[PDB]
């Protein structure tokens with residue numbers, strides 16, 4: 001139970017808008033995937049499978065704003 005960090009909201013947003021031009025706003029599973037590799041982190045993939053598959057409400061198999069925030073709320 002936590003919330004993203006302000007300064008961290010901008011940092012990620014900047015990288016999001018840079019990697020997201022389609023303007024579609026939302027992103028797929030692959031988009032974030034790669035971004036995960038570039039990010040100097042080491043998160044368990046097993047989780048993503050559980051979350052993404054347990055978060056994808058739209059059922060389109062794609063990540064979105066809320067969907068992304070929810071993943072962090074639990075993960076973080």
Ligand SMILES: [Mg+2]
Nearest residue numbers: 020024026027
């Ligand atoms: Mg996109």
Ligand SMILES: [Mg+2]
Nearest residue numbers: 056057058062
């Ligand atoms: Mg979705």
